[PDB]
Design a protein around this ligand. Structure first.
Ligand SMILES: *[C@](*)(C=O)C[C@H](N)C(=O)O
Ligand SMILES: *[C@](*)(C=O)C[C@H](N)C(=O)O
Ligand SMILES: *[C@](*)(C=O)C[C@H](N)C(=O)O
Ligand SMILES: *[C@](*)(C=O)C[C@H](N)C(=O)O
Lengths: 330, 330, 330, 330
């Protein structure tokens, strides 16, 4: 009859509370349990047979790699159950773009996986959480959502977990993608206008079942007068790969090039990303001789997205050439 | 008759060269002298009397604090002269947003200061540098441009140097501002639609003539599983202030808070900015108890922008409350 | 103590109702009275002394010129009262951009005039109306809002009534301006980043007290294979001016030029606007010889905005040169 | 070896000329022949074997239905030939979005069809036409471009001809799509990030080979105080379908509804589109009782886009329900 959708709660602002109804930016995250969030949206029963499960209760800015894994493996078990048609995960918006992309790479299933959260706490007036959840379930319950990879439903849109990013603060249209939304969801119906072109879920070469722990990967910011300090400190403390968030097209200061070459020889992967994330992408060999130095470009992925792909990829390969190929297909 | 405008060349892609006409992104920067540039745009003579001056020949990704000081002082000199009505500066786009903001804060003059660059080298077909420069001189020669603060002229727009940022890679519309452009420049004419509302140039409490050196300020990136490693390494190497490029609304991981509190007690200013730079701003006391920890909020300025203001501001005060007032007025 | 703000209700979706809480796009407009909308936001009393007045109850798509006048004159009376500090008007979003601009041109007062509405009806889950109203009052009560012209507060932003336009359907970030927002409002506080540069309110040469009725002005759309039919039919039925919503830069088909020249000679003002409204503006004499034909360009104003300015301007002048000047200053 | 690509010239600004190099917006279109164009881009020879063919020399604002048919049939001819791998068409930008969508609907071939223009004439400094054409041929020669539908290559992007629209005037980034670009083209290479999800070319139920003429379809604009004048005049002059460019979600004024009901009974199809074209879409039965009145909703297509689909669709059916299914699939 109706689809069986499971909601995995992880905390976030969607489960947070404020001092008054006028508090739409000042609140305490992860205060409400999954059962209460379901009860707050009575109409949910009209969309699917839904049951909630509290996986964790955290503010997403304080998420760890073990949390991601615990979440990834749990999702995998649910997707393996013939009694589960769709999966919705409520997650704080600060690192939601990171978790959504992670799942897109390691969940080998065509069942819909939808990640959702809200910019305003549930206690604020005109809170965006109720409709976001409703739309999340509506999409997870839809047959047309299968095989589209991980999705995020906020601001009446259906966004790809791959490249959607929290780009605007405070406002409910916080999440944007340089390549646009895949569609929209209005009054329960899903409307598609685009399809993903990058490898995901079922057609991914990675699998959360084979992963026991993630390699350490960190990010260093680049700007005027930057020195190699942050890069070396991160590498010396364990990083197996470093995401260079350079100016413009992954540009690197001449004062930092040496440390990067040295680090590369030492076994540390160097991936060039940038802090120009509204559009475009980093081109190989353009700003730096990547072939000569044996570095890797993150294509269009912003720093935090790059880190996620790098971590997953390195559980299978440590070959810079294979890494580049992966950054060009995922 | 015609206004007297001086062009201060600093390098960049606008002065760059590519291997072929088909090379629009792969090139070598700072290869052309200011004389060659001016020459390439004969029509300039119609707008005003122009003379070039090569201050330096660098790629902006490799700019240093001494280069800023050197450029800022030279600008203050030409502005004081009565034989100068407007000033145009060619600068690489990678850190143009940083130099543009710096000058907006320290040049105590109402004469037009216009910063311009090009996304494509002059050797590329359909290069954008010729028209950008022409519009730069057109704007710097216009009386209506006085008292507007530092301006940047690219993509037929008149952008404010304060908040214009390189947001899109590769494409010519690379520079955007969350609050929009101030106006446009078409066929030599300037059209205004908005006015700046933040303190700048003449009404700035800072003066390049009173600044001999700039305090060291660095930036740490925040993301899932981030540790206090980068923050401490940076402080250990001299940083007098640290820009925290947090997720969401300047959010800080619970794993890093203790290190940030210790660093503050030690005298390191802590400024919360973010990597959500398309819109909105970081609110004081929302995600963290800034009052209690004596931290500072960067308002709407992205990481590299906040670093510029922090530096300048710290040549005059080290009082966090005064620092906060400064971040709310400039 | 507190400011006295008056809320003039005109109907709209903000006062509309849906069949269920899941109905966020399908609803019946203008069903709720001003008193109920106030009672729905208890926190309002914390911002100012507020009183409501139901001016009319309509769906804004069915608004008439007499409605605008009735609204304009009413606002004028309130602004004349020493007992009124701010004015907030709830208005359907479909033609809100039209009414907000109208008021910006004819209300000779520096007191804050804020127009607001909502994309979702008050009965939908996560309805945006409550916070929008709250923010509308917060802004109207602020002293810093004076002298900024008419403002619109939705999606946590402070937009200029001049050029903000409903650009996106369904979503709460529906209103955008090619020149960006003037600021934002969060948890009661107003944050400014830009200032208007065009003439408005107190510095306008128009006055709602001198206007008894508006001249008829209509709009004709332009596209491939368009004929002069719509243009002539509108003129023959009373239009004193016609807004040409052309392709690109106010371009006109060669098959329509004649009718336009003929109409001009007959006394009908011809104003070239366009259906390219995300940015840029229409340039005089670029696509058509406006000087020779004696036509007028709408600069950056979209068709419906152009119609509003044209109507107001023609109550003072019928000189095409003065009309052009007006389109370049307002 | 190299692919065989044919360039069909139709005119436009790309083939235009300005009075001076400083003229980027003021110019005269369709002055250059296809041979002169190809010649101006020597590098083309490296991408493939190209031959030009001047089909017509017009300004796209003056295009007619016979020009569309003539262009569509010529395209179907070249596609059938085995001596043609890809097809490039230079077209004025003003109505390029219309021709691009038309071809996407009627060309039953998987060979790449790329439409390109230029915002600046070739006589302007920093003209954009040279690189745009180069990228057009680069994309039309690429095997990965097959089965993607009609494409448009400007601003280093690969846009879908279905929903790409000229949204910004003057600037080179004029063309945008609510659902984002499909990919980008840099230094001869194509990078894909999204795939089309709507029916096109090979899977289209329409075929230019079976279309001798197109039914007349016109567009009426809606705004404050609009009357049924334009709607009726248009129907009286032959319109078989009327595109209603309403405010908001295709909203219709209560003053116009009766005329629209009478026109429908008389056999005129009524299609509700809107002038809110940055995002979202018009929902069936939301603002008006479409089922009851037997009207049709344009979904996300702007007015000029909806007109193209209505025309094409009406060469096969006049059943409103089938028309609606068509507007939801293409
Ligand atoms: C609250 C606002 O969206 C987000 C929190 N910091 C979180 O991500 O838990
Ligand atoms: C070339 C593209 O603008 C940019 C530079 N690398 C520079 O900043 O010099
Ligand atoms: C409802 C949605 O915002 C808008 C109505 N049609 C109105 O403007 O009254
Ligand atoms: C010139 C700017 O692209 C455009 C044209 N008027 C045309 O469509 O021919």
């Amino acid at each position: 009859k109706l689809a069986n959708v499971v909601i995995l709660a992880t905390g976030g602002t969607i489960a947070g509370a404020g001092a008054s109804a006028a508090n739409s930016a000042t609140y305490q995250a992860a205060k409400v349990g999954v059962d209460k969030l379901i009860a707050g949206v009575p109409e949910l029963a009209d969309l699917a047979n839904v049951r909630g499960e509290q996986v964790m209760q955290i503010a997403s800015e304080s998420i760890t790699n073990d949390d991601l894994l615990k979440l990834g493996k749990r999702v995998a078990e649910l997707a393996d159950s013939n009694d589960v048609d769709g999966i919705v995960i409520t997650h704080g918006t600060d690192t939601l773009e990171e978790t959504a992309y992670f799942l897109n790479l390691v969940q080998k299933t065509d069942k819909p996986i939808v990640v959702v959260g809200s910019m305003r706490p549930g206690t604020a007036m005109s809170a965006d959480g109720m409709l976001n959840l409703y739309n999340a379930v509506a999409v997870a319950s839809n047959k047309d959502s299968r095989g589209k990879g991980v999705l995020v439903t906020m601001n009446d849109e259906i966004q790809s977990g791959r490249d959607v990013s929290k780009s605007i603060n405070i406002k409910t249209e916080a999440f944007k993608s340089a390549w646009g939304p895949l569609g929209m969801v209005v009054e329960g119906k899903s409307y598609w206008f685009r399809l993903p072109a990058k490898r995901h879920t079922v057609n991914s070469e990675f699998d959360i079942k084979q992963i026991s722990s993630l390699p350490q990967v960190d990010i260093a910011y680049s700007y005027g007068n930057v020195t190699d300090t942050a890069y070396k400190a991160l590498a010396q403390n364990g990083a197996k790969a470093l995401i260079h968030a350079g100016t413009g097209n992954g540009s690197v200061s001449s004062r930092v090039v040496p440390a990067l070459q040295q680090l590369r020889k030492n076994g540390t992967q160097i991936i060039r990303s940038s802090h120009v994330n509204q559009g475009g992408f980093v081109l190989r060999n353009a700003e730096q001789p990547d072939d000569k130095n044996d570095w890797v470009v993150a294509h269009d992925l912003n720093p935090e997205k790059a880190r996620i792909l790098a971590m997953v990829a390195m559980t299978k390969t440590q070959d810079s050439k294979e890494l580049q190929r992966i950054f060009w297909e995922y």
